[PDB]
Amino acid sequence: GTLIRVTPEQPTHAVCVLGTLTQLDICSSAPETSFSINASPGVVVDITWPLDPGVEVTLTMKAASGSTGDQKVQISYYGPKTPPVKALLYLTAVEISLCADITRTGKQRTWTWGPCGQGAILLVNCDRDNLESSAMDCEDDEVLDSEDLQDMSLMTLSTKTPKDFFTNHTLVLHVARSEMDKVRVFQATCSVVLGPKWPSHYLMVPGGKHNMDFYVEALAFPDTDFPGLITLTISLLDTSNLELPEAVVFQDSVVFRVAPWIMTPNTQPPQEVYACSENEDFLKSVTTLAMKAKCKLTICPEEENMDDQWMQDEMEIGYIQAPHKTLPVVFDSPRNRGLKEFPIKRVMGPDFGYVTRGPQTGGISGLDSFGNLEVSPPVTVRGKEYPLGRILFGDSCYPSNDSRQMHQALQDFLSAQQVQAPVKLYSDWLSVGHVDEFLSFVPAPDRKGFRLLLASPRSCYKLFQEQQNEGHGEALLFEGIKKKKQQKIKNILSNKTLREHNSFVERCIDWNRELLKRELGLAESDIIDIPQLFKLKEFSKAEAFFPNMVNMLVLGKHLGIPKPFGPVINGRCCLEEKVCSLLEPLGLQCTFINDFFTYHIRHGEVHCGTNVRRKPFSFKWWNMVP
Amino acid sequence: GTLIRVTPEQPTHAVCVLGTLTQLDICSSAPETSFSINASPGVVVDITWPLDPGVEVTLTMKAASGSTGDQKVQISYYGPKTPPVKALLYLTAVEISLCADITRTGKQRTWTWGPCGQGAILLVNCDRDNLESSAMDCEDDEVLDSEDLQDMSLMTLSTKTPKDFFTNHTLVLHVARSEMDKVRVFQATCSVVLGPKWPSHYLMVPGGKHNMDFYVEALAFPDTDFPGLITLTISLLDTSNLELPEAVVFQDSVVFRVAPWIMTPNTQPPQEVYACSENEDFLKSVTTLAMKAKCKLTICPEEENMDDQWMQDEMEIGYIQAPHKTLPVVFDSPRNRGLKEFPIKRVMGPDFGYVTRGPQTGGISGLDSFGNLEVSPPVTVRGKEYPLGRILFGDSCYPSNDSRQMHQALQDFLSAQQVQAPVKLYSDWLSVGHVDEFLSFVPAPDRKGFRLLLASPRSCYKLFQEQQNEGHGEALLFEGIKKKKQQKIKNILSNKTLREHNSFVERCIDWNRELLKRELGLAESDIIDIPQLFKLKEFSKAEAFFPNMVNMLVLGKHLGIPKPFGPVINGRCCLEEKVCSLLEPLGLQCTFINDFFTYHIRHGEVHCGTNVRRKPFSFKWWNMVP
Ligand SMILES: *CC(=N)NCCC[C@H](NC(=O)c1ccccc1)C(N)=O
Numbered sequence A, B: 001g002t003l004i005r006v007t008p009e010q011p012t013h014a015v016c017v018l019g020t021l022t023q024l025d026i027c028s029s030a031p032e033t034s035f036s037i038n039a040s041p042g043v044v045v046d047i048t049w050p051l052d053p054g055v056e057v058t059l060t061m062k063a064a065s066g067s068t069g070d071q072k073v074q075i076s077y078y079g080p081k082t083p084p085v086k087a088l089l090y091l092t093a094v095e096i097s098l099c100a101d102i103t104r105t106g107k108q109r110t111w112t113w114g115p116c117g118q119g120a121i122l123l124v125n126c127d128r129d130n131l132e133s134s135a136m137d138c139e140d141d142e143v144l145d146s147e148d149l150q151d152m153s154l155m156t157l158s159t160k161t162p163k164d165f166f167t168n169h170t171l172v173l174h175v176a177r178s179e180m181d182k183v184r185v186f187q188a189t190c191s192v193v194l195g196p197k198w199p200s201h202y203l204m205v206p207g208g209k210h211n212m213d214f215y216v217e218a219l220a221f222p223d224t225d226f227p228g229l230i231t232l233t234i235s236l237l238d239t240s241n242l243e244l245p246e247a248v249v250f251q252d253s254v255v256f257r258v259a260p261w262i263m264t265p266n267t268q269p270p271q272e273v274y275a276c277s278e279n280e281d282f283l284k285s286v287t288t289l290a291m292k293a294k295c296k297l298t299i300c301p302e303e304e305n306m307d308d309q310w311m312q313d314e315m316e317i318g319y320i321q322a323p324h325k326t327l328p329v330v331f332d333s334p335r336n337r338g339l340k341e342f343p344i345k346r347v348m349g350p351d352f353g354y355v356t357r358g359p360q361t362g363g364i365s366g367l368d369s370f371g372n373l374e375v376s377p378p379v380t381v382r383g384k385e386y387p388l389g390r391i392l393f394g395d396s397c398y399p400s401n402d403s404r405q406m407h408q409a410l411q412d413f414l415s416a417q418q419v420q421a422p423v424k425l426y427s428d429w430l431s432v433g434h435v436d437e438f439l440s441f442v443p444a445p446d447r448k449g450f451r452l453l454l455a456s457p458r459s460c461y462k463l464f465q466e467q468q469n470e471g472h473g474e475a476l477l478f479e480g481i482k483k484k485k486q487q488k489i490k491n492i493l494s495n496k497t498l499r500e501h502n503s504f505v506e507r508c509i510d511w512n513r514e515l516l517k518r519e520l521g522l523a524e525s526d527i528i529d530i531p532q533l534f535k536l537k538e539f540s541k542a543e544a545f546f547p548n549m550v551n552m553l554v555l556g557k558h559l560g561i562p563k564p565f566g567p568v569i570n571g572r573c574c575l576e577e578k579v580c581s582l583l584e585p586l587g588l589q590c591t592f593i594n595d596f597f598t599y600h601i602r603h604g605e606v607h608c609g610t611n612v613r614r615k616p617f618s619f620k621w622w623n624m625v626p
């Protein structure tokens, strides 16, 4: 909005940016009734008229000027016996537009969510396209490779002005000081105009028609103290008077939203599998499973591992997504065990981003291991859509001196990525304490296109009771293993303290069942119970009695399930048969992997020993309304 | 939600909290068809029935139990040739309700804004009811006075259980560790159960009917890292098994929203005026003005002042408001000049809260003085209501090496009080740089019930030109003052560099005019221009040429306006006459106060030398939808 005051005493000179509302004040300095308005054909006035202040006169230009004051407005004041008196306005029209991909196609004042929303997207430049640097590309103030610009967002300044216009006007590009530490802007022809050191920059623009390209990268993910928006503004300054200060004539802005970090559920098609190298036959089995599922396979060796076999736990592979660019990004967990370097050294790289949260020298729990970080498949809940699913992570039921939690910095980060609205589940009853110890998700061809699997002592008691009823009470759990105390179905069933333990575990699992039902919108027909016994040991914390079968590797329809070594009835482990009877009808393929004397005995299973990069959702996160 | 699994093998025992959904799993452990359901009259089952898993059985109790298992459910399984087989469920119904003033009358799972919203309110306990302490009451972990509880929010736990119930159950009260540093909870009969040191506490509750009262205070205002919600939860634990861990049976919560700090515009009725004590006749004039406006008057003496006369600038008196309690609260500015102690020592006190932001040892601007902090009267803008008005504060147009801004910590705080959605205006062209240097708001009996006053060189040129046209060109500005270079209207008008300066100032004021028009919804008919000349001096920054009349004390309809000492035409200063002609038709009373050789010459005026506590809005902030 602009109000030009017109004065018969002296002509006025004004600039008019096209797309702006220019109005006239004709009354303030009127002489002494009536006025008339004559203007050159480039000017459209909307409004032989009386000198009433309340009546509005608006001026709109159709085209940029070819020279200063090349459009004219003449206001004629007159009365009953007064010769008409003229006020002169000389206008200069210019085109100043700051453009970005506000419609999110790859090419209002605010950023809005959803399919009818508006607002451009910025990716954090947290990958490493640069040769032999150890840093994410956005840690310096330079575009070091041409490929790096593909991660960046394009913004253009179009101007159309007279050839001499910037003799007396200057354009400045700026960002609030508030936001300068989270963005960097390069000018193309390729060097920094805005960023952490500099919140504004004077542009060198020639008169006429000109187009100037900028590349923009984010430096920070949305977080507790950063909602995720960055506004960049162009200001047009009048520098006509050599004594007087600059005078802002016009401001325009674009508002960017920083891309959130997004996880991928087990129901997204797998692309690449990870584990550690002893476990040679364990590695054989996942190697064939990866082959069957068409996945690239990467392995971390003893040298790099530093003895760390829990490839599930230091990292989580998500992705960031903008209309121009989608890339995988590793969330590196602060647990900083022997795998501490793996995400940094050879998961971070060309088109593979990095991020980490939490204290890095100590201040951590078991529940900060990313076996305690999962996501549901897409779900709709009492009408609210979660088309990227909901992050799931384990916690206690209430905070006590003895309870554990994932570090608040991690929880806060996950929440500030609004788009998979986290749900806290109860996992602290488990010795290790990870949600993957009692749940998994698998694809299914019907209902909602998945099933929630839950560990279930109920199902295993039922299974073993049926076996006994059919005469197999002497059947031995742990047939196979040369150095473990074997146990008969009869004695398993008659052990009253084992049954009490498993009643307590069942309760803990039931509590979460119902939590997932409420928060994820599940009916029982969404859920499969997997026969699974547990035992309490050390602080009354639960570990698995036999290899924890729910803690499986999901590679499409190909499943890597820990071999339980259950009672062999008619030539087969009945646990394996029960699992197969439950999952094969969904068209899933179950391979049972011996993880016993390498994973199981150190309190984890196949899922705990592996990790998977999966295909990002096709649904665009910005088309959600969180 | 709860799913009880029933088993003919063995009876089950369950607790049922009234108001909860209890469902039965009848199929899982059914024998081998059909089942029937018989229950005692206290139990209503909703559901001679087939053994289909998908058919749901729900159980609801109407009354609390008098003893354990005093309600019964019996499930009869049968078939074609099978005698009916019974499963037994023994239920114990209890009443566990956590209550607060969720309807906001003084007495869903989420806090919601607006007149049909829900959610209780918590005040920050940032006043000082305690005798001779220097601290806000919420800095310790004790209720030291009975009056202190009036600032606190009541929350009640009602329970109705069997007399022996808490033999095998325990209740715990908790808050996330995330939120414990921002709340404190006392138990009444009076000591702390929850707070910064403790996130949970085991309640001692007797069986039967019991009611336990808690008092809750907030410790933090909503801010960048605190959206302003605090959830407190009660968990019911089963402690029946002496070996096994506690087992959560039921959780319920109340969600509190912390009251935001709120400012009061000049259109709110005044209650108390502040200034500093030399200025004896300045003090006389405000003393009479306060008297006319029925205001208490408090004065800060030379000893305490430390030479600081700018009582506008260290502090801003707002208020916090809950259904049970409203109190004034002083926002103490970090400028920490000679008035540094005044807000702490004798504005903070009984039913007068305190808050401060920003760095306190150095790191400040002129624009952190609270002459640069104002609010508009209530306004509606293109349909959006701002029923408490919009905070207004001064800034530059873009950040440069030479621009100033209010400290980000202050801006962030003001924004996080969502309820007066701040607007940044342009004040950095002014030497001192405060929005009060160029705007004020006054009550008016018509349109929107106020006018925006703006300083206007345009109006003063017009005024002086008319004077000259009427023959008064020799009239002297500064008639009155014995030691200042007087100046004739003729020479004022003919000074071309003065006119250039005032053209630039006009532009800066016009820019804000239009900003206020957009952001506040104003039409010109909302706005009065006040004749005012400026001059540029020192960095081309604007100061007032004569005492800045817009910088006035608004006490209802009684105005304390700086005496301009303008040209005396027909026995009166024509500036004073012009102002009176503009404001008297609105029914305002103008007193012109000589502030010349005490305020004006040190770059400020009457508003700058004073401060006002005003009446809080009657509209309840929580009934807004920000
Ligand atoms: C399943 C999952 N995500 N698991 C990680 C759990 C195993 C791991 N084990 C050990 O640290 C360990 C050290 C020494 C002896 C035995 C086990 C863990 N607790 O993180």
Ligand SMILES: *CC(=N)NCCC[C@H](NC(=O)c1ccccc1)C(N)=O
Residues within 6 Å of the ligand: B310, B312, B313, B369, B370, B371, B372, B432, B434, B436, B437, B551, B601, B602, B603, B604, B605, B607, B608
């Ligand atoms: C109008 C308003 N809110 N004013 C405060 C402006 C005056 C004050 N003056 C001085 O500090 C000063 C010191 C020494 C000599 C003259 C003036 C200020 N700049 O804060």
Ligand SMILES: [Ca+2]
Residues within 6 Å of the ligand: A137, A138, A139, A140, A141, A142, A143, A144
């Ligand atoms: Ca770079």
Ligand SMILES: [Ca+2]
Residues within 6 Å of the ligand: A125, A126, A127, A128, A129, A137, A147, A148, A151
């Ligand atoms: Ca890059």
Ligand SMILES: [Ca+2]
Residues within 6 Å of the ligand: A314, A332, A333, A334, A335, A336, A337, A340
């Ligand atoms: Ca790490």
Ligand SMILES: [Ca+2]
Residues within 6 Å of the ligand: A127, A129, A147, A148, A150, A151, A350, A351, A352
């Ligand atoms: Ca890249």
Ligand SMILES: [Ca+2]
Residues within 6 Å of the ligand: A312, A316, A370, A371, A372, A373, A374
């Ligand atoms: Ca994981």
Ligand SMILES: [Ca+2]
Residues within 6 Å of the ligand: B137, B138, B139, B140, B141, B142, B143, B144
């Ligand atoms: Ca206290």
Ligand SMILES: [Ca+2]
Residues within 6 Å of the ligand: B125, B126, B127, B128, B129, B137, B147, B148, B151
């Ligand atoms: Ca108090």
Ligand SMILES: [Ca+2]
Residues within 6 Å of the ligand: B314, B332, B333, B334, B335, B336, B337, B340
């Ligand atoms: Ca202070």
Ligand SMILES: [Ca+2]
Residues within 6 Å of the ligand: B127, B129, B147, B148, B150, B151, B350, B351, B352
């Ligand atoms: Ca009080």
Ligand SMILES: [Ca+2]
Residues within 6 Å of the ligand: B312, B316, B370, B371, B372, B373, B374
């Ligand atoms: Ca103020």
